[PDB]
């Protein structure tokens, strides 16, 4: 009717420009020289032009994706490549990542990764090492980690939450009813909630953060129940954004949420007690994460 029968036309508030400029190529040159990947490119994010560049006279940032550009999972919404046998870990990537961020001069940095279920620790030590190299070169730098669930491995989560990060992010993606339709079955809502809950008990001073995508077929009752379950898990920050089909072979958009409806969900986040609720059609987990953190948590 609205998806799997037809296609919804792209609304005008989701159209962005082709990435361009000097800041965009500077970041690209750095990543290729150091053999680094970003979630911006591999997930085909429409915000690349805004985050990575500007007019050439702005504060360029990008979310580096660790442990390669090939994931062990096949989330129906994610355009990151999938393979059963990903390439082995580049031990220099935690060290080269700190070089790229030192080059960009970022005060706030977001790191993420593909899932590496082939790794005994899910690659937690590889992630925590990158955070350590950052804090070694800049102790005052703020680093946010969008980590996998590690299949609920409590020792893997501890390794990351002890690396010294400031924000521990892990996305629930959708409402509990749609977990099996949207995510790789190795993830579920209770497991994702256990990750965010455990990182707080490993380091009570870190900020927990999660993101939800709308437009995958959920209803408002399921959304509010999800947000309510997140506050009871003591999650500090929340992100809501429009799901957008990245590849013709990925899920079709079930509904395009109006901009006004995202402004409503921002109010609900404030009513429930989240320290901030980044809400909007093009909002993603890492979108202007530095601004949202500094304007709401140091305020």
């Amino acid at each position: 009717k609205r998806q799997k029968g037809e296609r919804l036309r792209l609304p005008p508030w989701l159209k962005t420009e082709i990435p361009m400029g000097k800041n965009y190529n500077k970041l690209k040159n750095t990543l290729r020289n150091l053999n680094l990947h970003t979630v911006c490119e591999e997930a085909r994010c429409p915000n690349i032009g805004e985050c990575w560049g500007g007019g050439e006279y702005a504060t360029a940032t990008a979310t580096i994706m660790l442990m390669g550009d090939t994931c062990t999972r096949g989330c129906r919404f994610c355009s990151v490549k999938t393979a059963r046998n990903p390439p082995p870990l580049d031990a220099s990537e935690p060290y080269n990542t700190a070089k790229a961020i030192a080059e960009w001069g970022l005060d706030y940095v977001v790191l993420t990764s593909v899932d590496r279920d082939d790794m005994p620790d899910g690659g937690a030590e590889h992630i925590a090492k990158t955070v350590s190299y950052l804090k070694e070169r800049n102790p005052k730098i703020l680093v946010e980690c969008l980590t996998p669930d590690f299949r609920g491995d409590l020792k893997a989560i501890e390794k990351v939450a002890l690396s010294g990060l400031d924000v521990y992010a892990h996305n629930v993606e959708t409402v509990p009813e749609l977990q099996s339709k949207v995510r790789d079955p190795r993830a579920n809502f209770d497991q994702s909630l256990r990750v965010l809950k455990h990182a707080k008990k490993v380091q009570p001073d870190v900020i927990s953060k999660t993101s939800i995508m709308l437009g995958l077929g959920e209803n408002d009752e399921q959304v509010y129940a999800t947000m309510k379950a997140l506050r009871e898990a003591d999650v500090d920050c929340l992100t809501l954004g429009q799901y957008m089909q990245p590849t013709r072979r990925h899920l079709k958009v079930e509904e395009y949420i109006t901009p006004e409806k995202f402004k409503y969900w921002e109010k609900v986040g404030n009513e429930l007690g989240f320290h901030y609720t980044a809400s909007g059609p093009l909002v993603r987990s890492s979108y202007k994460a530095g601004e949202f953190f500094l304007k709401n948590l140091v305020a």
Partner: protein
């Protein structure tokens, strides 16, 4: 001989007919194309006139005329196979064909090696 516009559109001429499409850099940015809004045959376009649009699964871009002229043909294969412009942007994935009311406008377009520096600098 392929010239480019600032909005990532290319054009090639043969027998006084210009074939217009989008560059490889643009289709990669746009993604899997789904619908191509193309003008009716016989439309008279001025240079930089907006003559159509492309919609991909996760993006949409407008199509601006590289030349002044009259539209002579549209790529009919885009109705059944719009993915041609992604993996054949310079050959089978062309969009329209038009005349050249002012062939001197080709000097206002950058060459293929000037356009690679344009997207990389």
């Amino acid at each position: 001989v392929r010239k480019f516009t600032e909005k990532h559109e290319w054009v090639t001429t043969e027998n006084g007919i210009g074939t217009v499409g989008i560059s490889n850099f643009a289709q990669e940015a746009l993604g899997d194309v789904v619908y191509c809004s193309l003008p009716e045959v016989g439309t008279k376009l001025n240079k930089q006139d907006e003559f159509g649009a492309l919609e991909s699964v996760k993006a949409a871009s407008e199509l601006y005329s590289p030349l002044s002229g009259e539209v002579t043909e549209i790529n009919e294969a885009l109705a059944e196979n719009p993915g041609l412009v992604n993996k054949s942007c310079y050959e089978d994935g062309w969009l329209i064909k038009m005349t050249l009311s002012n062939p001197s406008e080709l000097d206002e377009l950058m060459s293929e090696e000037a356009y690679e520096k344009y997207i990389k600098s």
